[PDB]
Design a protein around this ligand. Structure first.
Ligand code: NNO
Ligand code: NNO
Ligand code: NNO
Ligand code: NNO
Ligand code: FE
Ligand code: FE
Ligand code: FE
Ligand code: FE
Lengths: 200, 233, 233, 200, 233, 200, 200
């Protein structure tokens, strides 16, 4: 059969990922521009929300050295690839869990619907990649919203998960933080309530 | 905004290290037990950020000046980023981090007894050029002992992060140095089942890129998922 | 005083590097043109100094303490000194010197641009024990550019001097590190015609002698000319 | 035939040899006890002398990074192998050439006569080993004295050099420095007047 | 005027023939006894002449017309000039000279009894094209006896001169012909120590470039020192 | 390590180099445009000088078949690579030694000062490449002028030559020829007073 | 790298381990001197305690053929290596679980404090080695005491265990048996509440 050049093999980010990708967290001086966790400026169109969560290992212990990357559509279900700090909204962000509490947060807006390759609309979602010590190759997951039940029910992606039970592991629980709309998304890497991870 | 016009070659998950690799202790409790759920590629996965407009500092890629002179072996780390088809990946973001000459990281959590170097930070970033080329100027890191087995030592390495054209292509990996005897012994290295794949992570001494009487050079090419256009979709 | 009780096995001048090795530029003008004159061994040649009563400092063999901590890869360099008969050479003077982590020597004449290390001198000495064992604690030296060809780099190495039982056994050499890619490209290494001889100059990684969470170890054994008693003279 | 373990191969001492064996010269602080160029204490028995010389390359240029080691008998023609800074006399010494003028010096006494393996007396002499950058394996030579002509004529060693003219290269020239008996011994590594080097 | 923007890969002096190769008798008295002094590259060494404007005659490269028809095997000698990186060297000067079909040279000092050819001069020049290609039309030269050993014969060869981008790249060599049994016996050829280096001087029969019922063709590619941009200088 | 394509190996120019590179000397007809020994036209700015010299072998015998190539800056210390016979000055030229007397000549202007890679000025010099029968790979040298003693003392290149005595081999001796300013530059390939050759 | 002789590979003790190492249990006659479960004689200095416990497999089932070896310091924190049945205290003992109930017992004293290699004190502990059928290579653990909470919190060994909850697995629960101070130490080879096992 035809064989292409082989992709460079992945390796764990390690415990010190911060020094390279989350300068503040490493407890180091930052540069002029840094890719961080505030995707939308207060003047960005759409519903502003606060996202937060913890990450658990197979023992139910918090993963305090995790690093996440996010990719989402704006409010109009549009992907803004030209990254720029000046932008009112950027489709890409980065976050990390506290070496203490071990919670991560992101400041953004609820993404609008986009359609799949077949033209069927997917429910509003946020694409996440998880990195950390002990993770050889990063994990892909998607965040869904509990207040989008009707849409969620129809999701061509969500509908691919054989067992309905597992689909729930993907739905973020709406709440409020300091009177602001917040959504909680806990990631269970292994065991009870293991979060669905994807391959693509 | 971005658009869905590309497809990416499915990753070979037997080439990359598996999730559960017992000798690397932490993978035990940090690897899923259920199978990954395969999904078709959509715009969500086939697009990603372009950092063409990021405001890069003048010494962003020069660890020798970005943090006096660091103590240690002065070297250039350069190479190219191509896809599986052999096509260059221009204007892509490449980030790196490493420990100093003694194997000490400039991180709170690093309690190794080798001292910190006042002139050394250990972080760099570089956007590939039109030809997919990147380069960094740094000092060769030292091996580091870690709590895995009772006498485990990570071979000298530099951590790398590459964006590529989509989130489907983003990758994190490590660069090792040609001939380092610790390579064959490391459990993280060994997380990779095929020895051929291991070779892919080894930077080669490049006397041709060296600055005489100044610094040596290492060549490290990177291959990301091959990109193709959709057809009969 | 010393006595003429031993004979030393004749040196193999095809094993050791020859005087004239043109790729090593300086050897050109510093090599005799006449043949060496062979002479029978006498008391003059079969005796030498014994350094058993030299008053060594407590840190003479520890380069980490003898000059804060030096920056670089902490390693122990240990081995044994035996004769060609395989017999240990006890109470013998072993001296060493080397550059710092960055390849800079603490010498006036050294103008390399890599900086000096405030906490590193680079000299050590050790008297082998009863069993011919010696050891040093130091940091691994860096490669150094030198004015030979336009882009010549010495592999990381440690200079060694060994006395032995007589002036007939006295030797000066260099230690190289296992797997260093610069090894095969060095004109000084290449003064040794036989690749098997080169192998003897390579120190091997010694995980067994390492101090977990602290330092690595390298093993380097040295063989001095074989010593035998006189017979039928 | 019978093969023994091979001897560890020699390597040049290099340009910075001083750092390890001639601390002062390197311009570095010395240790409590250093092996140097004063073999005899002023109160040592025998004829006190000062030895000096230069070392030349094949081009007739001074070798200013040369390192030398000496081994000689005491005034009674005795080898004192137990090295001690307390001794009035040590058989072993070290010297090096000035990075400027390029001249070495030694403070010792004239060695007494020693017999060869066959019982034949050798003329008074000092054994020398020369090390340096561009010297892959050290050179062995002997220093003889111009005022011991009678002895020299009968030295079993000197007598092994085929060409009488080559023997002259080993004879030090008596002089005086500050009213002290001195002997000049220049070393020509290569070319016109090349010094006899030995193998043993 | 010319600018100091490039660096040239340092020459491999064990690849090229040495100066002193005793079998080639003339080399003995014409080879330096001192080592070459290495010097950093400067504008003086990294620049060189550009001959794009030299006024070439119409048959500069056709030895068949540039001097009746010469007698001998009619051949096209074509190829490409590239650097070590494989980059083409456009508009570079390629000069060649050779003997006639009989091995006679049109030079006063040539006393060989083989006659001159009234229609043959034996000189050509060609400026490489946009792609690094050159071509000459000539007749295959004949071997030539020469006063070296008592029965020395040079294989059939064409002398070549190539400018390149700088004085650092300028080279003079010789082309030999595929299968010539004289090759291995030639002391000038043997000036080169590596058999693989020898291979590089052998032109290959190129039936694809030949003109049927007219002339055959030989292929000869030339590789000049690799050219790079300066970095972190 | 990384290995590039190897460079095509050099071969001697041989005794008949003239037919290819110095048509006149071969005693053959020349083409309309030849690259020769007249770098400057009478109307060229700078100090017009004549260069001459002889080439000697290790025996002290004249090398009557040498071929030389020169590269030099104009009077302003500028390298003029655009070769044209129409130019008043060309930075490049060629010359050869006569089969008789065995002397070569060049007609040029004294070159201006050029700075090395580090911004340090080099004394006025002419880059020379020597080719000939018996020379496997061409010899690179530099011609400096005796009347630039002040500049010469500070040349970073001249200064790389370890032994001062060797530096003198590179200095051409100012004279006059037919009331014109000339410099004599003899090349000694081997032996007594061997000329320094460079590698770069 | 340097390779030494490889250590002899381990093999499970198998089910009949008792015949060789726990004579009584095999239900076979004993020899005059047997190494058993009584480390202290009634007249041994220190606080006399009873140690007892069960061993569980991954299914929560009792392991009734296990064999255990214990190493501990005396009341003064001293290791007594010269094993003798005459001794008032032996630092080394052996025990096994009953083919019925499946409980082991040890008769000893509360060990004194010993310092680590760095000179830091370790909380009182008993070193345990576990062998049995199904165990290819023996399991190493440590038994700590709940009534030593203060010492425990500062143990350089206990502190190496990343997760606090895991540390608990190593603490024996103080009780009383027939009015005697006893501590219960249950081992869970696998799953829920899996005891920490060491490598050294
Ligand atoms: O625990 C890990 O995964 C680890 C520790 C140290 C290090 O350098 N890297 O790369 C990884
Ligand atoms: O020129 C030499 O001989 C030389 C230069 C540098 C160095 O490190 N060593 O060992 C030797
Ligand atoms: O002496 C020589 O170097 C020589 C003689 C004849 C010839 O054809 N080539 O090429 C070279
Ligand atoms: O089940 C076992 O592990 C077993 C059974 C029999 C036997 O002889 N050994 O050695 C082991
Ligand atoms: Fe790391
Ligand atoms: Fe050195
Ligand atoms: Fe020829
Ligand atoms: Fe059994």
């Amino acid at each position: 059969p035809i064989e292409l050049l082989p992709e460079t093999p992945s390796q764990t980010a390690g415990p010190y990922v911060h020094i390279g990708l989350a300068l503040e967290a490493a407890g180091n001086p930052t540069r002029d521009q840094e890719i961080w966790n505030r995707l939308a400026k207060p003047d960005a169109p759409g519903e502003h929300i606060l996202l937060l969560g913890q990450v658990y290992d197979g023992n139910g212990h918090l993963v305090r050295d995790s690093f996440l990357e996010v990719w989402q559509a704006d409010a109009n279900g549009e992907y803004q690839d030209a990254y720029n700090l000046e932008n009112a909204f950027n489709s890409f962000g980065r976050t990390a869990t506290t070496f203490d509490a071990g919670e991560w947060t992101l400041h953004t807006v609820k993404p609008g619907v986009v359609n799949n390759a077949a033209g069927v609309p997917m429910a509003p979602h946020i694409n996440i990649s998880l990195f950390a010590r002990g993770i050889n190759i990063h994990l892909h997951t998607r965040l869904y919203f509990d207040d989008e039940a009707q849409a969620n029910a129809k999701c061509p992606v969500l509908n691919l998960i054989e067992q309905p039970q597992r689909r729930e592991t993907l739905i973020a629980k709406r709440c409020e933080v300091d009177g602001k709309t917040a959504y909680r998304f806990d990631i269970r890497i292994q065991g009870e309530g293991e979060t669905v991870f994807f391959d693509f | 905004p971005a658009q869905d016009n590309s497809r990416f070659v499915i990753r070979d998950r037997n080439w990359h290290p598996k999730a559960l690799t017992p000798d690397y202790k932490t993978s035990i409790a940090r690897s899923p037990r259920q199978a990954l759920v395969s999904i078709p590629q959509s715009i969500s996965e086939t697009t990603g950020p372009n950092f063409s407009h990021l405001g890069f500092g003048a010494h962003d890629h020069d660890l020798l000046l970005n943090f006096g002179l660091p103590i240690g072996e002065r070297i250039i780390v350069a190479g190219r980023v191509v896809d599986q088809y052999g096509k260059p990946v221009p204007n892509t973001l490449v980030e790196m981090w490493q420990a100093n000459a003694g194997g000490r990281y400039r991180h709170k959590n690093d309690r190794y007894l080798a001292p910190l170097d006042p002139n050394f930070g250990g972080v760099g970033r570089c956007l590939t050029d039109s030809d997919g080329y990147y380069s960094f100027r740094t000092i060769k890191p030292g091996p580091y002992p870690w709590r895995n087995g009772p006498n485990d030592w990570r071979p000298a390495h530099i951590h790398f992060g590459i964006s590529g054209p989509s989130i489907a292509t983003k990758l994190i990996t490590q660069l090792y140095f040609e001939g380092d005897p610790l390579i064959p012994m490391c459990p993280i290295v060994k997380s990779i089942a095929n020895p051929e794949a291991v070779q892919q992570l080894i930077a080669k001494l490049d006397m041709n890129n060296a600055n005489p009487m100044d610094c040596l050079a290492y060549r490290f090419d990177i291959v990301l998922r091959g990109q193709r256009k959709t057809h009969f979709e």
